[PDB]
Structure formats: C-alpha cells, structure tokens
Design a protein around this ligand. Structure first.
Ligand code: DTP
Length: 305
C-alpha cells in the first residue's frame, strides 16, 4: 500500500466527490479546460494559471478604493466583447465613467447597464440576464451597495440576501458559460467568499511618476482563492492615469525576469537592438513599433502557457 500510490487513489476520489480541484497540489502545473477571458495583463494572466478569468464561474475582486479593481474588471469586458461577447453591468454605485472605459477597448454603445432600486432587484435583473444565456461576462458593482429592501424603507439580511441569489445563480451561470464578476471594497461577502471559484486581492502598492504629476500606479494583485489552477500566486502591473494597464510596461517587467531583455546600465535591450534608458522611456519605445512588442508577447506566451 505504497504512500504516493495510496494517496492519489483517495485523492482522485475527492475531485469525483466534491469537484475538479477541491484538492490541489501547489506545484502542479496542470492545464486543461481553459475557456478564459484575458485580463489584458499578461502578468496577472499567468498568475491565474490558465491565463485569464475562467468563464462560467463567479469571481470576486476585492480591494480598497482607488485600487484599480473596476479597471481590471472593465478590462475583462473589453476582451470579452472584442471577441463578440455580450457584457452586462449592474451599476449600484453609479460611479462609472464612459470616457475612460471606451479608452480600454469597451464597446460602450453595445453594453448592458442597469441601475436597480434594491438589493433584491439587482440580484434578479442579473440572475435573469444570466439565465438568458446571452451574456459572456457580467460585473456587478459594489457588493456593498446591494442594500436589502428595508434599510431603504423601514427597518441582518444581505448576509441572507446574497446567500440566496448565489445558490441559485451559481448553478445558473454554471452551465451557461457566463462569468460573473462581483466587486468588493474593504457582510454578505461571508458567502461570496465561499461561492466564488476565484477571489482576487487588488491593492495599490507604489506610484509611477517621472518628476511629473504622478499619473498611474504599480498595482499588486494576490489571487488568494483559486480552484482551477493552484492558489496564492501573484503579479504586479502598471495602470496609467486615464489609460489603463500598461500592456507594454507589463511586457518589460515580464521581459526582464524571463530573460528576454537585458538591463546593462539601466539601458534596456532586446537581443542586440537596445530600447532606451529607464522604464518610462522603454514602454514609450514599444508603444510605437508593435511588431517588436508582438514578438515578446509571442515569446512569453511560449515560455509558459
Ligand atoms: N475620476 C477619474 N479621473 C481620471 N482617472 C481616473 C478616475 N478614477 C479612476 N481613474 C483611474 C486612475 C486611478 O489610478 C485608477 C484607479 O482604479 P479604479 O479601478 O478606477 O479604482 P477603484 O476600483 O479601486 O476605486 P472605486 O471603489 O472607486 O471603484 O483608475
């Protein structure tokens, strides 16, 4: 009754019993199923293990304000649509800014937005839309704003309100193939924390300036809960003030550790043809000749999945 031999037998019996990856082995580099929505953040993409949000699963993305959570999610929408997908936004914060969005690749004019009047309302006009089997992705804004009917009328539900909608709506988008993004902001999240298949921790680390007015910021995302690929991985990226995730910038951060670029004297170089000094000067260099940037994305998309 060899150890390893006895382990895998009882172990595989679980996936059968409770789910695909109820018991994951942190090192395993397993890859199967896929069906993901790029987050336009290569880095983060790998972090997930399958290169993007698994479609057909409830995802949580918490983090304090200004953190860039919305941005990520929106990015998720650009992609989800830039591939013929139908997006649904359940605005309950009413903070959304179109101009910024449209600058990320979102097809606003063909985006579903809805501003419910009560917690219940939101959780239905959403669940309903999911059962319509038309949406590819659907974010809901601010788990918090989802206040029970009362507490708006007369006078803890919510911890209950959320629970219900989930049990129902988890099965629904489960065989619909429509990924549901929720958005926390450090209640009901005591259940979302248990339904979500992937919960993200978005929190702003640094600030990306150049003796200028600062602009964006280096964001750190730690994927504390994952059920498709192994959990706990993490990745950082740049978010430019009014422009979004620095695909180019992310391309250098990743193109330097992976050994596809070299930094001799703070002087960037991609195999014999230098890029410039500093970072803000290099991302500016790729932002031009996309064929050069394309190779690197095409190169890192090889070193890994
Ligand atoms: N009113 C604005 N004007 C110009 N750029 C903005 C504005 N709001 C956000 N941005 C851009 C630059 C900020 O660094 C970046 C922050 O990420 P965002 O996801 O928009 O914050 P957030 O999701 O953590 O806070 P919130 O809870 O308000 O949504 O988005």
């Amino acid at each position: 009754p060899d150890r390893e031999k006895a382990l895998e037998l009882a172990m595989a019996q679980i996936d059968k019993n409770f789910g695909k990856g109820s018991v994951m082995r942190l090192g395993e580099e397993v890859r199967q199923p896929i069906s993901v929505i790029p987050t336009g953040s290569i880095s983060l993409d790998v972090a997930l293990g399958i290169g993007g949000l698994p479609r057909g699963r409830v995802i949580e993305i918490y983090g304090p304000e200004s953190s860039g959570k919305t941005t990520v999610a929106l990015h998720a929408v650009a992609n989800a649509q830039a591939a013929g997908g139908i997006a649904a936004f359940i605005d309950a914060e009413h903070a959304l800014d179109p101009e910024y969005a449209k600058k990320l690749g979102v097809d606003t004019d063909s985006l579903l937005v809805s501003q419910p009047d009560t917690g219940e309302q939101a959780l239905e006009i959403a669940d309903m839309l999911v059962r319509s089997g038309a949406l590819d992705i659907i974010v809901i804004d601010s788990v918090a704003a989802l206040v029970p009917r009362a507490e708006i009328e007369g006078e803890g539900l919510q911890a209950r309100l959320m629970s219900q909608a989930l049990r129902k709506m988890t099965g629904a988008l489960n065989n619909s193939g429509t990924t549901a993004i929720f958005i926390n902001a450090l209640t009901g999240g005591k259940a979302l924390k248990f339904y979500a298949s992937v919960r993200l921790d978005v929190r702003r680390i640094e600030t990306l300036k150049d003796g200028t007015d600062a602009v964006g910021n280096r964001t750190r995302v730690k994927v504390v809960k994952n059920k498709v690929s192994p959990p706990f991985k993490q990745a950082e990226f740049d978010i430019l003030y009014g422009q979004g995730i620095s695909r180019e910038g992310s391309l250098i951060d990743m193109g330097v550790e992976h050994g596809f670029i070299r930094k001799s004297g703070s002087w960037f170089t991609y195999e014999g043809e230098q890029l410039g000094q500093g970072k803000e000067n290099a991302r500016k260099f790729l932002l031009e000749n996309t064929d050069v940037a394309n190779e690197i994305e095409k190169k890192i998309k090889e070193k890994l999945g």
